[PDB]
Symmetry: D2
Subunit: 498 residues, 4 copies
């Protein structure tokens, strides 16, 4: 019982030794430096995010090279993320530089490019040609991140739409426009996005944060855009609207993970419904066994302030309580005054919330929602986590090359950390988005074939000992395959470290 658990939570009891949840930082001017990055990584940064909505290929090249330099300096594996610009619906150019609007005025939204360069305070151009046809009277239009609200009145021309202004705001040249409720037939990947993805794939980005995902087909378009060179790179779809949350089931199946992009989602859907969307998306991603990132204003006030609001602390804590693997900073680390301090605060809230969680409940809730019969790979992974709770194991060790086994072990949310012994360095950086998983690399070319699992196994137990989780005599759960049939785990064994 949550009520029975809460009555008895000690504010004076010691927190957990290890940190299970992961932190994702947006690299910007405040954090592009190799010294600033070595600072974020030391504070808690597991994944470096690049927002491609702005910035040149020379800028992001510097971000790629600087994160890799800082990571190699500290001897850590950090994931490189590419947040695509995505399909945009922007306004035209405004007459003499700007145009202001007052509550009551009758404005005209035209799709004829004649009003593109010449946009007055009475009529202006919009990128979307479907616009007058898709948007029907009574319906709403949001301009400049929902700052100015427009109500559709009547269709003037086959290109124009008569609108009522009900929010006093001044619009600048080619400002963004969002259409609530309506199904937008924009491309999955824009012309820039395809060139951005090409640069990303060629430069070795670990994962892609696919901006504005509405359908599962749109996810497949992104994987196709990645090609044979980007076959193994993760696709984390960003849910930014109604079509995201409506087709969440299909988008989960198609994607490698999901991001609750509360930023654009809060502009599309009503503010109060973003909590319900968060909870729904996060729990569906847990039953699925795919990573979940929470994303906007986690600790917003710390962009200028040295301490977060009471609200910002509960938001970081409850994202972890919900079941999120990751928590995200963007602007708090990109353009913020306290870049190291904000990550340090996030880490403390994560370890606190992690300690205030009933560890057995999350496993039993996920397990009981599982379809029986389970695949032998899944029944071995869930039972490995079951054994961990039973023997009170200080750590779980998994020999996963893809990361697919480590993700299915993390799916059953254990109390202890998961150590992943892998032969691929990409896997080391891709498990930075999955909870409780701490990767170790085994160089096959520099040590041996190790067909009989024993070097990777001895490597992992040694790492867990050094990191301070397991001491001599402690019991560890070990997951791999039997010397007979490999490619999926079937083996589970309980061993004392010593």
């Amino acid at each position: 019982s949550q009520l029975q658990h809460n009555i008895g939570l000690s504010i004076f009891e010691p927190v957990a030794k290890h940190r299970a949840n992961r932190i994702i930082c947006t690299i910007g001017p405040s954090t592009q430096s190799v010294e600033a990055l070595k600072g974020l990584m030391k504070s808690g940064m597991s994944v470096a995010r690049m927002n491609f909505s702005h910035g040149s290929y020379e800028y992001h090249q510097t971000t790629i090279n600087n994160v890799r330099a800082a990571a190699a300096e500290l001897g850590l594996h950090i994931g490189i993320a590419l947040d695509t610009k995505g399909p945009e619906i922007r306004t035209g150019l405004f007459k003499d530089g700007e145009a202001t609007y007052a509550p009551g005025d009758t404005v005209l939204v035209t799709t004829d490019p004649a009003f593109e360069k010449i946009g007055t305070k009475e009529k202006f151009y919009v990128d979307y040609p479907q616009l007058p046809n898709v948007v029907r009277p009574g319906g709403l239009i949001y301009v400049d991140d929902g700052v100015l609200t427009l109500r559709v009145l009547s269709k003037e021309d086959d290109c124009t739409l008569k609108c009522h202004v009900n929010n006093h705001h001044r619009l600048t040249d080619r400002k963004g426009i969002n259409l609530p409720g309506c199904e937008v037939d924009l491309p999955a990947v824009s012309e820039k996005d395809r060139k951005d993805l090409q640069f990303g794939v060629e430069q070795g980005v670990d994962m892609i944060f696919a901006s504005f995902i509405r359908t599962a087909d749109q996810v497949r378009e992104v994987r196709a855009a990645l090609g044979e060179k980007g076959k193994d790179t993760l696709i984390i779809s960003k849910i930014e609207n109604h079509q995201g949350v409506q087709n969440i089931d299909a988008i989960i199946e198609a994607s490698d993970g999901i991001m609750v992009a509360r930023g654009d989602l809060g502009v599309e859907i009503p503010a109060e419904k973003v909590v319900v969307a968060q909870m729904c998306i996060i729990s569906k991603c847990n039953v699925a066994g795919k990573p979940v990132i929470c994303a906007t204003q986690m600790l917003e006030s710390m962009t200028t302030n040295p301490r977060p609001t009471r609200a910002e602390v509960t938001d970081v804590a409850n994202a972890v309580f919900n079941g999120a693997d990751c928590v995200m900073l963007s602007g708090e680390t990109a353009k913020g005054k306290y870049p190291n301090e904000v990550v340090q605060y996030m880490v403390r809230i994560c370890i606190e919330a992690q300690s205030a969680t009933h560890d057995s409940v999350m496993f039993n809730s996920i397990k009981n929602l599982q379809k029986i019969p389970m695949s032998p790979e899944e029944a071995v992974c869930s039972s490995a986590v079951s054994s961990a709770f039973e023997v009170q194991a200080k750590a779980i060790l998994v020999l996963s090359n893809t990361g697919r086994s480590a993700r299915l072990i993390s799916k059953y949310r254990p109390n202890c950390p998961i150590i992943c012994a892998t032969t691929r360095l990409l896997t080391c950086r891709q498990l930075n988005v999955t909870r409780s998983v701490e990767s170790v690399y085994y160089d096959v070319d520099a040590h041996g074939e190790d067909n009989d699992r024993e070097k990777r196994v001895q490597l992992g137990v040694d790492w867990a000992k050094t990191k301070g989780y397991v001491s001599a005599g402690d019991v560890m759960v070990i997951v791999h395959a039997d010397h007979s049939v490999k490619g999926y785990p079937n083996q589970t064994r309980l061993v004392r470290v010593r």
Copy 2:
């Protein structure tokens, strides 16, 4: 299962008709006007709050009169709350204006009043005399809402303490000093507090928000300070330090309700632990069946901004999810630019979170934690709520003169609203702090004795019909007593409304 509930949450389903949670607003310059108050009350305000940390008695009666005028104009019962200044530890005067401090400096904190008017950037005065004795080396001292951190190095004088400056901050004249992790032997009620409470009991304040409650004995001191004239006024203890959370069990038993004053609590205790304190305090207050309020900066950004942060929305939602009877606005409504808009947003998050809650689980969690045998009054009230879930009752009606029965029904957190038919107007406003309850007054002198509880019963069913909760043919649970017993409810009846 919370996981199974979450995976089945619709962002497109309709919200609940009634609002169960209650909203408290701090009255300030932005909201002192009778028109501004009629605006808060229309937006969602159930209780008006008066922060006695500042403001004259002439100014506080201006708000008392204006709230009473706006309430009578709209025909509503709004509770009047007195948030006491409480025992304060302030510094001395900074000679030549202000003193500035740099990380590394050796400062002196003296209890000798010789440094009271003459406080330099090397030595200054502190209100607390028992300061060098209670605070031992290694310990921390927080100046100006914890902004400046100082660590005790050595005892210089029997009045002075040699300290190390931990951060860069500029201190003003008579700024606040908080002492983390140590028992402060300050009075429960200060000299100003006693005069404030006297004015409070005189002007007919419905409830007292007792600032900085450390022990249960301290709440009895406040009740004694209220006297025979303030016997019936509610005492809501504000948990502001580590002692409040340590003796929470005893403070609950002694108080009429509790407030999680996250503001001063976040300054005393580490930021991340305020979530654990919140959850613990809120759930303990539910098992006890006593109101619990959430407070510090919930929708903070809306003081300047017309929309809240993603964090602020989840904070309001999760306070309701935790089990909070109330949610509070301090400064957002006091000095805020959008006073009506912030309350309107809070009400929308409350109704959303209220809909995303598992109706039966909260009742069964609270019921199973109660000691058996139950008192006949409690077994009637819990079974009335059990009947409400069983018959799918659209509303519960209770005849409660004190409000103790309505609080005992709200304790079992029903899905429907609770209509309280009372003979006391104080009860109408005192139940603005309890969840689901919506009071109706029965003027005994203007209608009749109603010894056979029937005029009140017909009054209540009429109110529920008009407010739109119950339609013709709907079933209602009715709680009162028979003729052979009084003072406590005995009877429960399921009636089809005509």
Copy 3:
């Protein structure tokens, strides 16, 4: 948990004060005497059963008059049961008095009445004309309570059937025949049964044990046979085969109660499957809220022996554990050597099993299987039982005239006894088949109208006090209707006896 409950069952702890389960005795030569009946009633007999398979209308008249005399002598209400002879399939007359059969022989079963009086060890007559058509080769035929098994080989004539004998047995004149698996199209009520039911209805029998019920339509035929004079008499359908257990759902809806007639059922269906049928039928009758009688060989060895077998004791105990309201003796009391002793043993096993039962589980199991929204009558009855567990009530009092309310209170299986205050004497004798219900009669013509519930209420509390369940100061749950709308209960009140 059953395992957790069992570990902790004390063989030395004191048993319950009251007996919740009921005992039904078959009246025969050993128990027809007014002194023998006063002996059964004193030992535990709540219902007197008359097996109409044998015995004249003069014999059963004596049984009716003698039970009524014994009941009036002891001042108790005992139910009079009529177990109908039912549709029979009997053999013809055997040549020179008998015919024997050996494993391997080829026998002939003819439907031509030419073989009725002349039945040799090679060919004999059977009552059922559908017989050769319905019974197909490979199928089984059971003669003389399944003692001799016959396998169908081929259809010789349109009246005859060639059979293989596979059990050495000697058949007598017009011995019984049972057809396993097959659907028998016999009448619901035979020519004798209709005259028997006429005698029963006219003599005032409280209930009818309808022999060999296969369909719900067959139940309606029995109620039609009872007419306007037998409108209020209970129909307890006897499940004696495959068609009984297959259409159990429909037979439950149509009947007033059910009897697991294990006797004929064990001859029809395989012996091991009678446990599964028992458990299924008993639990379905609990969710339905209709009485369940368990019936054959409860304590068989005690027909000749003064002590039962270890098996017979677990059978009586587990019938009570399953959820049976009643347990039945037939032959153990009818022709038995120890008629008083067998009932005395049954009562001791019932009180023991009643004490070893988790009282809360049976209520919560039944309640959670209930369809929500519940009728106001049901939500008040379940919540009255919920209140009883909560306040630890020593007894529940119900004002039921039909018995329908007392049966729905007993449906939620409370820990305490249920006292039924009724205005009908038939109701007093019909609640002898429902668990925990102990009836009290209120003579309307001899005391008053009592439109305001208070005489019946004071009558009940007095009865519970005298019987020793409630002492002064004890809390009682009282169920009736509000002075406004009667005919169904809506009122529930918790009162202290004193």
Copy 4:
């Protein structure tokens, strides 16, 4: 929920392929023949029982040799059980043949051996010397299996006791005397018992059924009497009195298994309380993970009758439902007319009850009552059973030389059978008392060392395939250890059979 399970039980659904429960038969005149034994073994006998209360050593080796011959002929492993005579309290000789007693008479029970050979209907001798001292007035004495009841009135001599005859019975020479509700200080092992156990350990009996176990110290006395030659033989303690049930916890810890000897227990303790003792003892033995047998008259009527009573069928079914590893026949197979038929009926009730059981509930009930942290051996075994339910495994394979691992897997009551590949033939027969287990022997001297557990693994999968449980493509859970550890299982693997 058991109620929800029951309401969904099909009397027409197919039963389980394997039989999980085990059957024990008492060898007597009806079943001593090698052909009669080959008949019992073919019908269901897993363990052969020898009642040493009667019969010479010459006669008991005749059964030892015949069971071993019949087992070797059919190629099966059957356990040889020695049910000791135990400490007996018998009367003296009745002068002139027999003595008769009538209700009301004043009899004398003397401990002076002067009345040993000369015992009249007024005074007789009793074996127990401490009888007048231990038995105090008001107390009961049971003569000839409790048939004759006598109440102590007063102490006549320091050897005699004046008693009141409670019922009419005729006593024979040297009939048994049981003393209810008092601690009998008789030896654990009698002079005959020690010589019987010596013969037992000499002829290689697999298990000892220790008659009349009072304390845990008494079971250690029996283990001491077995010596170094009988170190590995199982000690199944027979609970026969009120002390056995009082010290059940300690008797469980000390013993290798338990028998609910309902026969003598039903004579000591009241008949109705034997159900509560059964349930308690059986469930405590499940949490402990030790075998538990049910015994006295389960299918009693079948000693003379060809079909059992309705009661006898529910008794066999409910013993399996309770959690009994074994069910026993004493006299039904020893002196019975239908020895093969009774075992055949028992097997059918076992498979029926086994099918009507909730597979997962028993596992989860046992698992949740176990102390955490679990030993690595136990967490492997429980998780192996957890995996079996998850993957829907058709069989579990265990390599257990002692049998301790197979008993630990059977402890978690899986849905499928357990195949035990052992290197000891004693283990093959000792596991005939544990549920689900079906042993396979691996002759180390005739095949190889098999240090890498693979020949045994291939042996087991082959056995499961042949017996028809696992088909091609089916998944099996395999439990053993790795090379780095031995003596206890460490590994668990899920393999698809080829």
